[PDB]
């Protein structure tokens, strides 16, 4: 079931995560918070030229095995 994905920063390191296609974008941000200490409200996740909405799943966005997403950091905006 599960699979690994990567989350790249703009100019730093890359994060490796273990996920399932049924995982929501909100879950993935939780997993980053677990591995890096970044709250989800400070995280924009990007894939294929757009930011990803929290309540949608990876399979929803056609995110597959070994895909690389991008993490752009932010302050909490409302």
């Amino acid at each position: 079931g599960s699979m690994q994905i990567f989350v790249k920063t703009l100019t730093g390191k890359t994060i490796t995560l273990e996920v399932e296609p049924s995982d929501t974008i909100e879950n993935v941000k939780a997993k980053i918070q677990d591995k890096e200490g970044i709250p989800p409200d400070q995280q924009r996740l990007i894939f294929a030229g757009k930011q990803l909405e929290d309540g949608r799943t990876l399979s929803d966005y056609n995110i597959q095995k070994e895909s690389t997403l991008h993490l752009v950091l932010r302050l909490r905006g409302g």
Binding site: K8, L10, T11, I46, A48, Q51, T68, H70, V72
Partner: peptide, 30 residues
């Protein structure tokens, strides 16, 4: 070309991973 260069930050990306490069350049806009 073997590699691409980000036109904004000068990071180098292998040309074979084109979605990842394009996403990187997109993320500058954000």
């Amino acid at each position: 070309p073997l590699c691409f260069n980000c036109p904004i930050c000068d990071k180098i990306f292998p040309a074979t991973e084109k979605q990842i490069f394009e996403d990187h350049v997109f993320c500058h806009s954000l």
